[PDB]
Design a protein around this ligand. Sequence first.
Ligand SMILES: Cc1ncc(C[n+]2c([C@@H](O)CCC(=O)O)sc(CCOP(=O)(O)OP(=O)(O)O)c2C)c(N)n1
Ligand SMILES: Cc1ncc(C[n+]2c([C@@H](O)CCC(=O)O)sc(CCOP(=O)(O)OP(=O)(O)O)c2C)c(N)n1
Ligand SMILES: [Mn+2]
Ligand SMILES: [Mn+2]
Lengths: 556, 556
Amino acid sequence: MSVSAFNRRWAAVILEALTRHGVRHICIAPGSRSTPLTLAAAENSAFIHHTHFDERGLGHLALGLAKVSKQPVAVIVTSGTAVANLYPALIEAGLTGEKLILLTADRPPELIDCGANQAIRQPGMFASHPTHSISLPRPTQDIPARWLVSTIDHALGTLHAGGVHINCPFAEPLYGEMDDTGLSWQQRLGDWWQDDKPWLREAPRLESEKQRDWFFWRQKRGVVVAGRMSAEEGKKVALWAQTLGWPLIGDVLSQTGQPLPCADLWLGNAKATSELQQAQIVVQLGSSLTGKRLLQWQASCEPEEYWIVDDIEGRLDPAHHRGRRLIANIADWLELHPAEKRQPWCVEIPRLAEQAMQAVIARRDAFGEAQLAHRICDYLPEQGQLFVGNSLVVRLIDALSQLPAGYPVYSNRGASGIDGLLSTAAGVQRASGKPTLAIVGDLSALYDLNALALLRQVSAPLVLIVVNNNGGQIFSLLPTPQSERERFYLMPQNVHFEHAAAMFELKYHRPQNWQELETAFADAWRTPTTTVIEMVVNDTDGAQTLQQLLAQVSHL
Amino acid sequence: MSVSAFNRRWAAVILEALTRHGVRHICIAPGSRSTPLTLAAAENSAFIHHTHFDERGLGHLALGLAKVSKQPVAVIVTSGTAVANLYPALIEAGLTGEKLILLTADRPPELIDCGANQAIRQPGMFASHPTHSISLPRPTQDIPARWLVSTIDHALGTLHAGGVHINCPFAEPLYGEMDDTGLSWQQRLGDWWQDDKPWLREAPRLESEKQRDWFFWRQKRGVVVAGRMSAEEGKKVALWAQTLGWPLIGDVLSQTGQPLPCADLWLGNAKATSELQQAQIVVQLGSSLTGKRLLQWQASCEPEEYWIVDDIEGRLDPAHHRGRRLIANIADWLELHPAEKRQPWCVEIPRLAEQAMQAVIARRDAFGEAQLAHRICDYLPEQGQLFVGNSLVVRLIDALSQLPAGYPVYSNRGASGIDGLLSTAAGVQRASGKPTLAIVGDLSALYDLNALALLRQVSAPLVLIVVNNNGGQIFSLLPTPQSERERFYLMPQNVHFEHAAAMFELKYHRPQNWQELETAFADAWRTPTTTVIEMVVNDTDGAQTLQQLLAQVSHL
Ligand SMILES: Cc1ncc(C[n+]2c([C@@H](O)CCC(=O)O)sc(CCOP(=O)(O)OP(=O)(O)O)c2C)c(N)n1
Ligand SMILES: Cc1ncc(C[n+]2c([C@@H](O)CCC(=O)O)sc(CCOP(=O)(O)OP(=O)(O)O)c2C)c(N)n1
Ligand SMILES: [Mn+2]
Ligand SMILES: [Mn+2]
């Protein structure tokens, strides 16, 4: 009889099913049409609930939670442009593998395409970007609960990576006291309600087989390239490459300790590129390589075979080398393809890389963004994690710093958007509970400015460094035309972030020299709150510093 | 030979063709992949250029420009999540008819699905929401310039309303010096470059035919409902209805002058609906009706025929009445179906409407949001325009105020998103150059908070009133369950907007009483700048006032 009651019973099945697949964090934005989903989630004690008013931010908060915890994270939004706002986070999840479960409330079919308020066409809205799309029917008892839980069990069970869009139509009335309507319909699931398993267990694993000729290839002159991977995997890749005697080119996202640091610099040296030409095989573990010189070297290297090992699917080599694309957990893959101790074949590169670090160290004194990135190791929170933003900061750190082996780094380097970095960082912190250092540019912070509301709640100290060089100065680094650069590229906004911090009652510092930067950190790490540290620097110094070091190191 | 130069010639054709279809405003966000488009736009003198760092805000800025100018507005963004951020404005445009031309730069096909940075699958990404989608091929001279301009001319030429997605892949290099490459390719268009018309003129008109039985129907007992329409059309509808002797139920968006004001209250009176049961025909002009009582009356009324006249396509009656759905310019439609002077047939409703307004007037004194809405007609800037936000404020003004006929009102009541109101308002101002009054809630303001960046540049005074009732109090109006209401619906953020105004150097007022509010207004209209006025009010006072007034009038 009661439509509102059945809606919530219908919804309760969906949310309880999710808990059988390890969903613990759920991010909720406010709405009315989402009432059945939101009320079922609120009443279910298995969940940790997060809220936000900005659905674009909500998406990235969830992206952050899934990024660190490696479990699927659910999102609830109401119908309309609220759903559309989940698109950036969904597209990023599609690239880097985070499991986002988007539960999008909808008008029922009779309120579609008839000029009803807050009614849009939602099925298929995200095109091909979700891993799996479910368009749920108009709730009705004539469809049994076992069908509904199975549909969800299928989507979550077979989810190797990426997002699941579950569109959820609900007809009014949405509110009203609880009736018995739908109760017996639910009870057709029996003691599944007391169980901890899915109704339907469908969980095939996707993995490449062992390469039987590995023991043949590990004898050749090889190069190891390490991109984004877990902290423990980075440590393991360093030992593995060192044992093999192959040079290790380590991205800032690899957490390998970068035993050959400043690769973006020494790879620019002809002696380095000449020596790497003797490489017969390249084994790349991880992907989304950061540095330009590395991308250029990868694009041009012509080994007999090119392998990329990663747990995400699809092609990952933008140069399309002859070789192999191996789907596996990186740590698992290393145990299956073990190193055996062999004499190092590189002699020139270890010298060049050390000279390269030396040239950077010689310029460490100036109070600029290049120097911050170079020295950032000195500022990492103990037993914490680094969240690196996009544009210059991730590049300067890749090229100029040597990050410690196994110290956790997180990022949004799938599509490399600057639209969710503060809110993503909030999720990265909440997932692990660790003290967090997050570094972003001035435009990035403006972009996700209202996410400072989320940073009012962290479980441990989070230092947010906003590097303010007045615009997107990455476009001072690229060869953009001078006449239009300022108006159409840099887009300086001429702001500071003191009032932003005060509005959300966050501590704020604007250090003028290294001593004052060091004082600000000492203060910030004392409490489980977010501290904003704004570093004001001359617009083009970072880019020019990077360019000069490249030129200097290439002539060594 | 030169790839960078041809990229620019190819784009030059794209942007020049748009100028032939009335495109004058172009909104640009920063990026590298967009270089051919952005440099092509910057060098074309036909355009007025606006910039912004937030692509979501950018989209809404364009939406506002198009909303007021009723001309197509172009948008240029770089590849990636930048593209996704345009979705909210595009969906809205698809519902209310704004013509947005989205030029979304893309990676070339050989860099799709292979792990390249910032490259995602962009074709078809907006699903069915653009009116038309163009997926441009990889730029090449082997495809004639006349094909490219013809492609754009077909799309803009046949564009009745809504958005066009033009995906524009470009291969690197993007930079370099301008070459001769592509010159003759362009010159194949001959003196089209000096012309002012499209290469291909395809502009069929879509319009309903004259209703041959209008002389029969206009003599019946009719009801006129006015939804959203232009300011001039509103005055014309008022005269039209008044001549017919038909009661006019005028929405806050109609600008008809609302001769039977407070319809949201008196429609709740059983005597009014009893009289309306005599109506044999309903003629509605415009759509997106605001009030709950009007939507409920529409749903339950049963005239022999229900007509909806509007210039946008598709069904607009969420109640699906037997009747007609007529596509036409409303003013054109009125001249084709003129009124005949006839005796008004309604007797009970004019009394009720007057008593209803009396009841609202009796409560005008309290310093609350409900009184603000009621009194807003007293604060409209002379020769200016009102941008009204979503949630409560548009409902309170609809229920409690009587706006003057022909006074321009703008809104986002397509999808009713709270995600782009500040940036839309900025666009609404820049298009007309008129003094603007914009009113939004605290969460709406937080949502589009970085759009304050845009509000630093207006051509005339813009007053932004932020009603701060600490959360989304529309969920205090709706029968949401109290236990979860605060955390999961209202979501109070406990902030103020003084520091936000300070961050962007906007003057700020927080009035304590009507005198201080009128003082704030007097100050603001004096300079071509944005003034922020934050009205702090008791959380639930507005919702309850509305609920009490509804109760009172229903008992009259
Ligand atoms: C949502 C969206 N829309 C537009 C862009 C384009 N985009 C970039 C990509 O080119 C960066 C590729 C990368 O990092 O790998 S960087 C950039 C400016 C950032 O300025 P900043 O924060 O002040 O930092 P700074 O440059 O160090 O001074 C933009 C606007 C984007 N990425 N995402
Ligand atoms: C992008 C998006 N996401 C979520 C929503 C849902 N939604 C609403 C729709 O229900 C309003 C339909 C309508 O206006 O008719 S209103 C609302 C809260 C607004 O709070 P406020 O600005 O502080 O003002 P106040 O509530 O009057 O106190 C939300 C969160 C949305 N519309 N769009
Ligand atoms: Mn910057
Ligand atoms: Mn509010």
